[PDB]
């Protein structure tokens, strides 16, 4: 894997563009706030941004909030990976492991 600390920006742009809910499985896109309130209203959370807030703040309901989101399916990065070999660690000049705040430039090129 590759992972790091997402900024509010990349969470906002993950949910807006690629965010989908799990409703009776079925992976429904979140194109209207009424879908979210319908299945997350129980916890608060009636808007797409309520979701985003409950995520980045690591809310009391983060478990239900986050599991509601279908796994984001990103494309390969657009600027490429910046590395000649992916399967070493970031520190080693590869792509994997925790790259910290640099997870944003990657994820943004994959979103």
Residues that bind another protein (CB under 8 A): 90-91, 93, 99-100, 102
Query: Measured between alpha carbons, how far is 107 from 111 in angstroms, rounded to an integer?
Result: 6
> From another protein, RNA, Mg ion, none, which one binds at residue 1 (CB under 5 to 8 Å depending on kind)?
none
Task: Single out the residue of 85, 89, 100, 101 in contact with RNA (rule: CB under 7 A).
Answer: 85
Nearest Cα to Cα of residue 40 among 18, 15, 17: 15
User: Can residue 38 be called a binding residue for RNA (CB under 7 A)?
Assistant: no
* Cα-based distances in Å from 17 to 21, 48, 97: 13, 11, 25
Rounded to 5 degrees, what are φ and ψ at 82? Answer: 70, 5
Residues in contact with RNA, shown as a per-residue x/- string from 5 to 34 under the rule CB under 7 A: -------------x-----xxxxx------
Minimum CB separation of residue 98 from RNA in Å reads 19
């Amino acid at each position: 894997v590759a992972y790091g600390y997402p900024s509010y920006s990349t969470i906002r742009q993950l949910v807006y563009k690629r965010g989908f809910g799990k409703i009776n499985k079925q992976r429904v896109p979140l194109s209207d706030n009424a879908i979210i309130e319908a299945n997350l209203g129980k916890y608060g959370i009636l808007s797409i941004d309520d979701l985003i807030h409950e995520i980045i703040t690591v809310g009391p309901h983060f478990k239900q909030a986050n599991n509601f989101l279908w796994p984001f399916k990103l494309s390969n990065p657009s600027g490429g990976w910046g590395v000649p070999r992916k399967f070493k660690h970031f520190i080693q000049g590869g792509s994997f492991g925790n790259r910290e705040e640099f997870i944003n430039k990657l994820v943004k090129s994959m979103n």
